[PDB]
Amino acid sequence: AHRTLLLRLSDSGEPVTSCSYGQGVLTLPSLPLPQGKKLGDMPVYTVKLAIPAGSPVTRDGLIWTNCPPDFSTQFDREKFYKKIIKTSFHEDDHIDLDIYVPGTYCFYLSFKNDKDELETTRKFYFVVLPILSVNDKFIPLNSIAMQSVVSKWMGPTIKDWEKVFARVASKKYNMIHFTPLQHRGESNSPYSIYDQLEFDPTVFKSEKEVADMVERLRTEHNILSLTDIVFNHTANNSQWLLDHPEAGYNHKTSPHLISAIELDKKLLDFSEQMEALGYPVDLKTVDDLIKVMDGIKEHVIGELKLWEFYVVDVKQTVSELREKWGNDNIPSKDDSTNLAQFVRDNATEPGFGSLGERGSNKINIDKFAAILKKLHSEDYNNGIEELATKILNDINLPFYKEYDDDINEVLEQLFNRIKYLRIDDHGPKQGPITKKLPLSEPYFTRFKAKDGEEYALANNGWIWDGNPLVDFASSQSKAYLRREVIVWGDCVKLRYGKGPSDSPYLWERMSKYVEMNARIFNGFRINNCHSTPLHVGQYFLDVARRVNPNLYVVAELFSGSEAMDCLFVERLGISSLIREAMQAWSEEELSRLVHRHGGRPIGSYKFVPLDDFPYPADVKIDEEYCAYNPDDHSVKCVSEIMIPKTLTATPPHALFMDCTHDNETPNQKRTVEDTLPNAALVAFCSSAIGSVYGYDEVFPQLLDLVQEKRTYSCAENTGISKVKTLLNNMREEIASEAVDIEDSEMHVHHDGQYITFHRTNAKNGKGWYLVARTKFHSSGDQMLPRIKLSQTKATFKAAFSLERTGDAPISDEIIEGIPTKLRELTGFDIGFDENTKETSILLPQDFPQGSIVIFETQQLGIDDSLDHFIRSGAIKATEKLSLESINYVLYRAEQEEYDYSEGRSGAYDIPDYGKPVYCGLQGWVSILRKIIFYNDLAHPLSNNLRNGHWAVDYVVNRLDLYKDKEGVAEVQEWLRSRMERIKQLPSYLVPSFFALVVGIMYGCCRLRAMQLMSDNVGKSTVFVQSLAMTSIQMVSAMKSTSILPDQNIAAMAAGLPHFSTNYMRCWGRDVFISLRGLLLTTGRYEEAKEHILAFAKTLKHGLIPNLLDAGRNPRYNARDAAWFFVQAIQDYVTIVPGGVSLLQEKVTRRFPLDDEYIPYDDPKAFSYSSTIEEIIYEILNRHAGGIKYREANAGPNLDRVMKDEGFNVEVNVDWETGLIHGGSQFNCGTWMDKMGESEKANSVGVPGTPRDGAAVEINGLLKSCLRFVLQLSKDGKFKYTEVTKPDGSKISLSSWNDLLQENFERCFYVPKNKEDDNKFEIDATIINRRGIYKDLYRSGKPYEDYQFRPNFTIAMVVAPELFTPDYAAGAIELADQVLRGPVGMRTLDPSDYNYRPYYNNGEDSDDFATSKGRNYHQGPEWVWCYGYFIRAYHYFNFLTNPKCQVEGSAKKLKPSSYLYRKLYSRLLKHREWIENSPWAGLAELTNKDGEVCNDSSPTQAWSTGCLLDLFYDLWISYEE
């Protein structure tokens, strides 16, 4: 059915962590194959790789992976396959990795660098666990009970072994771990193997014998099997070690140990001659042990040549010097020792500073002459002897000090270990000399080979602390020399190299040894895996997995850190890590160990796709979460939306051993009674568990793996066997339903000698409660407090006490255990309050140390059908939503909610935190995303969610205000029914289920939006869809305002929250700048029409107003609005199908045509009907014919700081140029309309940026309007070409169009060369940078004409014909370098003297430029200008730079990856902003260089709509 996981990658190809579970590994969940199918019938898993659109990796990017393409292909580690990344700037690309067989797979990405070079990412591994079945019943990996048994002590025959099998089968273990079942060596240690390719001839002969015994275990006792595999060493007496001695580190293969060889055999030569030498041998004399090796200083050290291994032979070099004296970096005595080291780095020969031969380090005498020729006496006798001798002696000064530090560690390590082995340090074991025991532990197992030579391999062991990853036998280490090796004489080196080329027979023999056990057993076990080299373990485990595809791997892995552990688990394919419960020194350490492997906290948050995922409109869905069948064994999606289960790093699985075959007995470390609680605490952990044989049967002491020959007793059902039968059988009931990490929860408590373990299943509410009194020591009576479980019922399951009945039987042929009584306990009182639904549990006074009690518990209100009810129905509930109604479910600012609630409601106040930014689900999701990611159950929202049901009912009771709107009623009922069911749960579970219901409904709403919008939005990246959701944030119906004076309908707000209510909401300039991005790009055609019709009614003076008071008394101080309005009409007709129908739409006009007064009530309002066709011409003709007025109701009651002359602004056209002028020095007719008001700074009524005269945007939009109506008349959709002049003259629209074409660039452009200043009208006394397009033509203050501002880019976008390309490309490149901030566009050139980029509206200081906000447009970085900027930056770079073009499919020149990369880099700060903002949008304004402006509006309509304009450009022109 559906076995697909989603693996999202970053912009650098790295996998993204959906949750923070800690340092982990991309492990895929162990699940049964679909019923009936077997390996190969279908992909076991499919990893969906998600690559971000436009990321640098997509540039000629390839997905490499070592995953076989099909089941027929064998797995090769280093054979990677190619996958083509489908590059797009809008849509992410998904690439499936079909996996047919378990193993270790990895992937990396190759792409074209920014340097046009090739680059590669890291290799990223993910493991697919094996499928463990016994007959035809699936064994989940975390339900494994492993009994580790040792072959030596199981008996003589196979039938004597099957007696042990029947005993562990009664204890209901399902896996047996075999110590190496092979031929042992001269020590009978199970880990020193004679020949790895034959089994113990005492027990088995052929492979068939051991293989049939294993298959008998599977069939008769339902028990699987695995074995220890030894890679690091072999026995010291192997007949194949005589044939192939190069398999170990010898003087040929590893020459550096030659010095260590001659020191080890300098002790096997002294330990035998230890009568007269070292005369007091076994005399236990601490005050004479000095003398014991004070003579060794001369017995070995003095007889080892002062060690020429380091030191250059001084006189044998002067001999070699005189021998061959005939054949500008030179120092002198002035660099005393640099002269010496000059030879060390310029005159030494291949192999210096290198341990190997006795005379390995030497000198190059043939070029020593050429160097010494450019020196002193060209004749040796003259004292060059002593000179070179000192030069050489100076060279050997560091080697001598390297020697003294070496020797000190050689003997300091000796007189410290000699003590412990024999002398009573803490563990005594005396002994003088022999061959069984010597003086020095053997360091180099020596023998004679079949080639006749006397070889010298060595043993292996473990240094105390030494990277536990380096080879002490390798040349990098000096441990065998300085005697820093704790050796095992039983075992001998195994020298693997960089591959099979360094030791061919060793790699070939271990290959057939590994695959021999892989044919038989279900898996392996690797002791000291951290010491086996990585490339060695990877190869042989891959060979094993080719034989046994379901190979289960256990490893005792204690590397340097958790990261190194995860890397080994990643690459090797380890399926389980060994944890030892006996390592806990105290009760607190045991509860902490139990805490790590117990599970997740109770009431943990559940993952959900939120506002960080793409929501493709064309997505498959489980309409009622019902397309699942239990026999399919599919991994389930989170909700009705079929976004597959996420693949995230999880901690490597664990196999918790209450006691291994290497650690001491409970009897030894603690007491015998601790065997019962220590095993119960381990068995309650949500992982794999195991135990050594004898732990359950309470053997007295740890069995010596080397010496002991006694056999396991046949005494059945001793000690814990009865309890382990109960525990293992209980875990078999649980294993059927528990699946993933979010599905098993835990609470663990430690109170003195008691440890509480509460195991809970998060799906059904079932659980187990374990009370375990530990017996680390007999430490007096201790009473445990009353146990209180909230909203839970408890049931007694079982209870036991373990008591010691005397000491252990002493025998010489059986290993018998300490007698133990197993008494069942009673007295536990379980009280249940039928009101508070609280269960109390009291322990009885007869509960001695070493006892346990188990309860079956069930959380109230939870059943198996809860998860289905919460995850279903939400899509059908959103079926009737609309792009308007979604605004009331997801957003609504607090002021927006007061509008509907008359100021009673508002946003929920989270105590100790505050209120969510929106009232709807977005306000919750913005807070919940970080909470779920970190499982922050301590967050104030998490605390409040379990403290009461207030937030639960707040989500449902809000929608009573908007119940009548489309689809809101059914959305509320879904929330009502689900939240009602949630309140019936225990309090501590409410937060997890609250965030689950909210996220599910939020996802269904966000998907509903993408479906209602157009394809370009509904198929794009998260960033584009996040931008598009701002359209829903701003378009809402209100009560206190609207866009129509008669009705309350949807109205685009300027920004939230401060531009949302009353007249502060609608602004004509803001509406029509954002109309194309928020409404046309998204597909809201009918809503964009309503806004055009609404403002068309409010035309006066031939001008569209900025401040719209819903069409009653609007403010007409906007010289910009009318041209953004007539441009939006052009954008409407260009995009909307059948958009020319808008021109003949008839709006009821309002204030009379003759620029009359204010009669909203007088019947002269609903009077002269006007079509959009005549409204456009009414604007074009009224500007040309001349306008002269003073604002209606002029006086303070409109602008109480504007001056008397400021109220009479006006406008007309200079017909020698054809462009529009207007404004004055007391004006603010443009978008930079900050009016001063500071009385302490003396600026009341002074505008900060009046833009009088020819504005670039107005003239650019005018040219766009003229070009629009000209082609419109060509198609018979515009009747008019006559334009009246104040006198009465007439000019055709084409002539006015050509006038700007001939004169616009002439007036505004400032040429780079001083030569052509005589053509572009420039007074060079007032100029700053050339190559710039002007900001204003003939303004009041002429220096404001030649200022670098982002406004000229509006003209470049709407009227590109006005620009010669080379001038426009160079001018916008300067803006990229000078005026472009990270998110906003600098409103004024930083090099200017008026540049103040910090905006503070409350400043009272006496600064004329900064006080009370005059800076508003003189430095601050605005985000919407960035949209118009990057739109033209894309356009003119695409036309100018040849690097920005590449071949177009079917011959249509498209942009290049070079340009897409430059566009993508400039939007990263925007995608970051909308990602990490409580308001899901972009700010209106930003202080200098990205600094947050507190006074800026957090989400603005035209800040995002201008970015959506860019994406629509790239889509509508290329993506066809």
UniProtKB/TrEMBL annotation:
<dbReference type="Pfam" id="PF14699">
    <property type="entry name" value="hGDE_N"/>
</dbReference>
<dbReference type="Pfam" id="PF14701">
    <property type="entry name" value="hDGE_amylase"/>
</dbReference>
<keyword id="KW-0378">Hydrolase</keyword>
<keyword id="KW-0808">Transferase</keyword>
<comment type="similarity">
    <text>Belongs to the glycogen debranching enzyme family.</text>
</comment>
<dbReference type="GO" id="GO:0005980">
    <property type="term" value="P:glycogen catabolic process"/>
</dbReference>
<dbReference type="InterPro" id="IPR029436">
    <property type="entry name" value="AGL_euk_N"/>
</dbReference>
<dbReference type="Pfam" id="PF14702">
    <property type="entry name" value="hGDE_central"/>
</dbReference>
<dbReference type="Pfam" id="PF06202">
    <property type="entry name" value="GDE_C"/>
</dbReference>
<dbReference type="InterPro" id="IPR010401">
    <property type="entry name" value="AGL/Gdb1"/>
</dbReference>
<dbReference type="InterPro" id="IPR008928">
    <property type="entry name" value="6-hairpin_glycosidase_sf"/>
</dbReference>
<dbReference type="GO" id="GO:0004135">
    <property type="term" value="F:amylo-alpha-1,6-glucosidase activity"/>
</dbReference>
<feature type="domain" description="Glycogen debranching enzyme central">
    <location>
        <begin position="719"/>
        <end position="959"/>
    </location>
</feature>
<keyword id="KW-0326">Glycosidase</keyword>
<feature type="domain" description="Eukaryotic glycogen debranching enzyme N-terminal">
    <location>
        <begin position="47"/>
        <end position="135"/>
    </location>
</feature>
<protein>
    <recommendedName>
        <fullName>Glycogen debranching enzyme</fullName>
        <ecNumber>2.4.1.25</ecNumber>
        <ecNumber>3.2.1.33</ecNumber>
    </recommendedName>
</protein>
<dbReference type="GO" id="GO:0005978">
    <property type="term" value="P:glycogen biosynthetic process"/>
</dbReference>
<dbReference type="InterPro" id="IPR032790">
    <property type="entry name" value="GDE_C"/>
</dbReference>
<feature type="domain" description="Glycogen debranching enzyme C-terminal">
    <location>
        <begin position="1030"/>
        <end position="1508"/>
    </location>
</feature>
<keyword id="KW-0320">Glycogen biosynthesis</keyword>
<dbReference type="GO" id="GO:0005737">
    <property type="term" value="C:cytoplasm"/>
</dbReference>
<comment type="function">
    <text>Multifunctional enzyme acting as 1,4-alpha-D-glucan:1,4-alpha-D-glucan 4-alpha-D-glycosyltransferase and amylo-1,6-glucosidase in glycogen degradation.</text>
</comment>
<keyword id="KW-0328">Glycosyltransferase</keyword>
<feature type="domain" description="Glycogen debranching enzyme glucanotransferase">
    <location>
        <begin position="137"/>
        <end position="552"/>
    </location>
</feature>
<dbReference type="InterPro" id="IPR012341">
    <property type="entry name" value="6hp_glycosidase-like_sf"/>
</dbReference>
<dbReference type="GO" id="GO:0004134">
    <property type="term" value="F:4-alpha-glucanotransferase activity"/>
</dbReference>
<dbReference type="InterPro" id="IPR032788">
    <property type="entry name" value="AGL_central"/>
</dbReference>
<keyword id="KW-0511">Multifunctional enzyme</keyword>
<dbReference type="InterPro" id="IPR032792">
    <property type="entry name" value="AGL_glucanoTrfase"/>
</dbReference>
<feature type="disulfide bond">
    <location>
        <begin position="626"/>
        <end position="637"/>
    </location>
</feature>
<keyword id="KW-0963">Cytoplasm</keyword>
<dbReference type="InterPro" id="IPR017853">
    <property type="entry name" value="GH"/>
</dbReference>
<dbReference type="InterPro" id="IPR006421">
    <property type="entry name" value="Glycogen_debranch_met"/>
</dbReference>
